Design a binder for this molecule. Structure first.
Ligand SMILES: *[C@@H]1O[C@H](CO)[C@@H](O)[C@H](O)[C@H]1NC(C)=O
Lengths: 215, 214, 208
């Protein structure tokens, strides 16, 4: 199966540079024309660049040309997107796509935040209910930057009754909560734990949900 | 540049329904029009290429149509996993450009919200912060209203809310509501009340807790 | 430039269930120009005012038009059950919408009249076990599924129209019944307006 994997995204200062990469597998890479399509935080999709199979040339919208450089290493099956003179209108999820008459395969994307704001570790506070066949817990991931964070429960084990709320941005800091509902039987009979990963600050903290020791 | 317009930004229908999504182009693109599905987790896959041709791996219920500048996508026999946002895209001339997108909501039975309220954790209070969190989980329709009360009086300021996209599995929506004040001010009160108003009931669902009673 | 409303002025307008939809972006409009060519009987909007919709900027403007007797004005309210709102026509309840009932005057000569007024009184799905009749309420900004089996004009009041659906579509039948209203001396029409706001553009604005 055709597979596209983006890497290299991150937080960047305005005016700065960053090179994205995309690992391609499952098809003859040198045979297809490849493109980048970004999705802004506004969910707007914008074509960014495409490069020929060879590629004897490359094509850009004006809104990106002279600053971006799409390139290709057919021997090592990777696609690149060298960005420079970065703007805040460049922050978006960036997708590696296989192209031709259409973008028939998409990678999962890698994020780019172009900000002057500072990287800040998250504080993770447990949300246990105050003192039913189901019980809802939570974690409060407060004051991190930038996006994204990852939140899982018991290292992925708890996925059924889980939904993680979208982060809310306020004063250059993000905050989100995750809600997990497990039966009342395994809590607190069985350990329930939220796992917060923040790659940008390389901070990963685990928070065991302990019942509110309310004395 | 060729502009791509989708007649609507959002659409809703029942399971089994036949759904159509329309797309207008600003000039003749000669059937070079593609349709993409983006699911709530963010993953994008091609559905239809060149107006009407079914992409490999995409079920027969999906179909496309149209010519000139006016094109359509159709989903017959709506299925749960069809919850997603659908985009059109023209491939006639550079720059390649996308429609603004159409979100597909799949109708379900009315459902009242599950309401949970959490006090500030000991960790947060230690650092002088006081966030009161209220969860409003798994309800339908998506519209809902939250009202906070502190020792009986309504607090509008200092509230941060967050909504889920439609749940891919149960077709519901969920919401988070957080009231942040200072530790100094949080300790100056006793009762904090969370009221959820939803069309499922004329009386609001109420969830509260006491700071001292713990 | 110039939002063209000309398609409204020529030919025989469709019935309510197969309303014509004009979509405007990247152009300048004059609402008060078009409506003046008509004899307007009613002009009701939701989440917006009649004066405002003629003078605001949008990312998109949707203009639906069809034949509709002024006598069934009642059946345009989402307030009523009504065969019209349930099976034929339902606007977006989230964006600002206007609903306009006008009569084409003697001096508007380029519009032609239909033989009569037609609407869907019933749209349902007869399931595999030929017991369960399931009504098919029209979704907002959508056509009824019964547009495919109801003729552009209903042949005779009380006509049933059926088509068998495939197992893919879940088998069974699509079943519709149609109603007719006698044509009036001058044609009575209906206009549905919907406006949308978006990232960009300043696309749809009144011309000056
Ligand atoms: C059409 O008739 C209406 C009233 O019957 C009148 O107000 C309008 O000026 C006339 N316009 C033309 C072009 O005849």
């Amino acid at each position: 199966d055709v597979k596209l994997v983006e890497s290299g995204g991150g937080l960047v200062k305005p005016g700065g540079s960053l090179k994205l990469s995309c690992a391609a597998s499952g098809f003859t890479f040198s045979s297809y024309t490849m493109s980048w399509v970004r999705q802004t935080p506004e969910k707007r999709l914008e074509w960014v660049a495409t490069i020929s199979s060879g590629g004897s040339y490359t094509y850009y919208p004006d809104s990106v040309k002279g600053r971006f450089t799409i390139s290709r290493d057919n021997a090592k099956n990777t696609l690149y997107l060298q960005m420079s003179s970065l703007k805040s209108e460049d922050t978006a999820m960036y997708y590696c796509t296989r192209d031709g008459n259409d973008y028939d395969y998409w990678g999962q994307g890698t994020t780019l935040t172009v900000s002057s704001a500072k990287t800040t570790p998250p504080s993770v506070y447990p949300l246990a209910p105050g003192s039913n066949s189901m019980v809802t817990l939570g974690c409060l991931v407060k004051g991190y930057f930038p996006e994204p964070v990852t939140v899982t429960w018991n290292s992925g084990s708890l996925s059924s009754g889980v939904h993680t709320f979208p982060a809310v941005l306020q004063s250059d800091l993000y905050t989100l909560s995750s809600s997990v509902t497990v039966p009342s039987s395994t809590w607190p009979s069985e350990t329930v734990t939220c796992n917060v990963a923040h790659p940008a600050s390389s901070t990963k903290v685990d928070k065991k949900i302990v019942p509110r020791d309310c004395g | 540049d060729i502009q791509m317009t989708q007649t609507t930004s959002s659409l809703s229908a029942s399971l089994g329904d036949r759904v159509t999504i329309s797309c207008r182009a600003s000039q003749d693109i000669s059937n070079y029009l593609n349709w993409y599905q983006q699911k709530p987790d963010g993953t994008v896959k091609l559905l239809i290429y060149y107006t009407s041709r079914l992409h490999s791996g995409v079920p027969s219920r999906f179909s496309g149509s149209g010519s000139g500048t006016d094109y359509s996508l159709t989903i017959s026999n709506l299925e749960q996993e069809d919850i997603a946002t659908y985009f059109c895209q023209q491939g006639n001339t550079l720059p390649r450009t996308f429609g603004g997108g159409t979100k597909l909501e799949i109708k379900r039975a009315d459902a009242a919200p599950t309401v949970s309220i959490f006090p500030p954790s000991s960790e947060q209070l230690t650092s002088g912060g006081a966030s009161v969190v209220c969860f409003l989980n798994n309800f339908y329709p998506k519209d809902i209203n939250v009202k906070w009360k502190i020792d009986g009086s309504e607090r509008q300021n200092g509230v941060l809310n967050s909504w889920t996209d439609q749940d891919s599995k149960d077709s519901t929506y969920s919401m988070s509501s957080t009231l942040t004040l200072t530790k100094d001010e949080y300790e100056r009160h006793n009762s904090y009340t969370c009221e959820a108003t939803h069309k499922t009931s004329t009386s609001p669902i109420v969830k509260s807790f006491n700071r001292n009673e713990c | 430039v110039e939002c063209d409303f000309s398609p409204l002025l020529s030919g025989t307008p469709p019935q309510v269930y197969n309303f014509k939809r004009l979509v405007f972006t990247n152009c300048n409009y004059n609402l008060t120009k078009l409506l003046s060519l008509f004899s307007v009987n009613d002009f009701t909007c939701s989440q917006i005012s009649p004066a405002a919709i003629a003078s605001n900027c949008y990312s998109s403007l949707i203009l639906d038009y069809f034949s509709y007797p002024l006598s069934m004005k009642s059946d345009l309210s989402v307030s009523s059950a009504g065969p019209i709102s349930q099976f034929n026509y339902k606007q977006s309840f989230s964006n600002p919408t206007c609903l306009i009932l006008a009569t084409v005057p003697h001096n508007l000569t380029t519009i032609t009249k239909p033989l009569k007024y037609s609407y869907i009184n019933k749209c349902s799905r007869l399931l595999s076990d030929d017991r369960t009749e399931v009504p098919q309420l029209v979704n907002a900004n959508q056509y009824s599924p019964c547009v495919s089996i109801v003729p552009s004009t209903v042949w005779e009041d009380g006509d049933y129209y059926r088509k068998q659906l495939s197992p893919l579509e879940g088998g069974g039948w699509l079943v519709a019944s149609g109603s007719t209203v006698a044509m009036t001396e001058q044609l009575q029409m209906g206009f549905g307006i919907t406006v949308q706001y978006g990232t960009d553009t300043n696309s749809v604005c009144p011309k000056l």
